[PDB]
């Protein structure tokens, strides 16, 4: 994917990671996001609890700065 200026997303729906490059999120988790892979809806990539990876972009919401 592509790097972007670091931003924070709050998870809205649960997602369970399966591959190395995915992360698990639960509603309310805050992810520090620095990557995207464009798609419909595509993927966002970032760090949560010491792990890094993709999660589906429509499963979280951008937190205003
Ligand atoms: Cl797609
Ligand atoms: Zn493995
Ligand atoms: Zn992959």
mmCIF file of C-alpha atoms and ligand atoms in Angstrom:
data_model
loop_
_atom_site.group_PDB
_atom_site.id
_atom_site.type_symbol
_atom_site.label_atom_id
_atom_site.label_comp_id
_atom_site.label_asym_id
_atom_site.label_seq_id
_atom_site.Cartn_x
_atom_site.Cartn_y
_atom_site.Cartn_z
ATOM 1 C CA UNK A 1 0.000 0.000 0.000
ATOM 2 C CA UNK A 2 0.994 3.675 0.444
ATOM 3 C CA UNK A 3 2.186 5.670 3.449
ATOM 4 C CA UNK A 4 0.106 8.573 4.756
ATOM 5 C CA UNK A 5 0.458 11.138 7.517
ATOM 6 C CA UNK A 6 -0.175 9.278 10.764
ATOM 7 C CA UNK A 7 -3.826 9.431 11.962
ATOM 8 C CA UNK A 8 -5.978 7.584 14.464
ATOM 9 C CA UNK A 9 -9.025 5.400 13.759
ATOM 10 C CA UNK A 10 -11.546 3.987 16.238
ATOM 11 C CA UNK A 11 -12.742 0.462 15.442
ATOM 12 C CA UNK A 12 -16.498 0.099 14.983
ATOM 13 C CA UNK A 13 -16.886 -3.626 14.179
ATOM 14 C CA UNK A 14 -14.850 -6.696 15.140
ATOM 15 C CA UNK A 15 -12.332 -8.128 12.679
ATOM 16 C CA UNK A 16 -10.190 -11.220 13.358
ATOM 17 C CA UNK A 17 -6.731 -11.361 11.794
ATOM 18 C CA UNK A 18 -5.647 -14.533 9.977
ATOM 19 C CA UNK A 19 -2.596 -13.757 7.867
ATOM 20 C CA UNK A 20 0.688 -12.311 9.187
ATOM 21 C CA UNK A 21 -0.082 -8.901 7.694
ATOM 22 C CA UNK A 22 -3.521 -8.442 9.365
ATOM 23 C CA UNK A 23 -4.471 -7.163 12.819
ATOM 24 C CA UNK A 24 -7.414 -8.023 15.032
ATOM 25 C CA UNK A 25 -9.613 -5.107 16.118
ATOM 26 C CA UNK A 26 -12.548 -4.880 18.537
ATOM 27 C CA UNK A 27 -15.105 -2.041 18.781
ATOM 28 C CA UNK A 28 -13.536 0.903 20.554
ATOM 29 C CA UNK A 29 -9.910 -0.023 19.854
ATOM 30 C CA UNK A 30 -7.787 2.949 18.745
ATOM 31 C CA UNK A 31 -5.424 2.129 15.833
ATOM 32 C CA UNK A 32 -2.487 4.372 14.844
ATOM 33 C CA UNK A 33 -2.838 4.244 11.026
ATOM 34 C CA UNK A 34 -0.068 5.059 8.530
ATOM 35 C CA UNK A 35 -0.903 2.906 5.466
ATOM 36 C CA UNK A 36 -3.734 2.409 3.037
ATOM 37 C CA UNK A 37 -4.508 0.024 0.236
ATOM 38 C CA UNK A 38 -7.142 1.584 -2.034
ATOM 39 C CA UNK A 39 -10.213 -0.467 -2.817
ATOM 40 C CA UNK A 40 -13.961 -0.801 -2.399
ATOM 41 C CA UNK A 41 -13.759 -0.391 0.553
ATOM 42 C CA UNK A 42 -10.090 -1.373 0.737
ATOM 43 C CA UNK A 43 -7.822 -1.622 3.753
ATOM 44 C CA UNK A 44 -6.126 0.531 6.342
ATOM 45 C CA UNK A 45 -2.851 -0.423 7.992
ATOM 46 C CA UNK A 46 -1.484 0.484 11.360
ATOM 47 C CA UNK A 47 -0.426 -0.472 14.829
ATOM 48 C CA UNK A 48 -2.463 -1.776 17.784
ATOM 49 C CA UNK A 49 -1.140 -3.370 20.994
ATOM 50 C CA UNK A 50 2.316 -3.988 19.603
ATOM 51 C CA UNK A 51 1.064 -5.604 16.372
ATOM 52 C CA UNK A 52 0.899 -4.118 12.874
ATOM 53 C CA UNK A 53 -1.265 -4.952 9.909
ATOM 54 C CA UNK A 54 -4.282 -4.407 7.685
ATOM 55 C CA UNK A 55 -7.967 -4.281 8.620
ATOM 56 C CA UNK A 56 -10.955 -3.495 6.365
ATOM 57 C CA UNK A 57 -11.238 0.253 5.955
ATOM 58 C CA UNK A 58 -14.999 0.423 6.590
ATOM 59 C CA UNK A 59 -14.609 -1.293 9.992
ATOM 60 C CA UNK A 60 -13.328 1.875 11.698
ATOM 61 C CA UNK A 61 -13.876 5.634 11.694
ATOM 62 C CA UNK A 62 -11.286 8.386 11.499
ATOM 63 C CA UNK A 63 -10.889 10.293 14.747
ATOM 64 C CA UNK A 64 -10.883 14.086 14.242
ATOM 65 C CA UNK A 65 -7.632 15.757 15.279
HETATM 66 CL CL1 LIG B 1 -11.560 -3.635 -4.142
HETATM 67 ZN ZN1 LIG B 2 3.007 -18.029 10.095
HETATM 68 ZN ZN1 LIG B 3 -1.753 -9.812 2.752
#
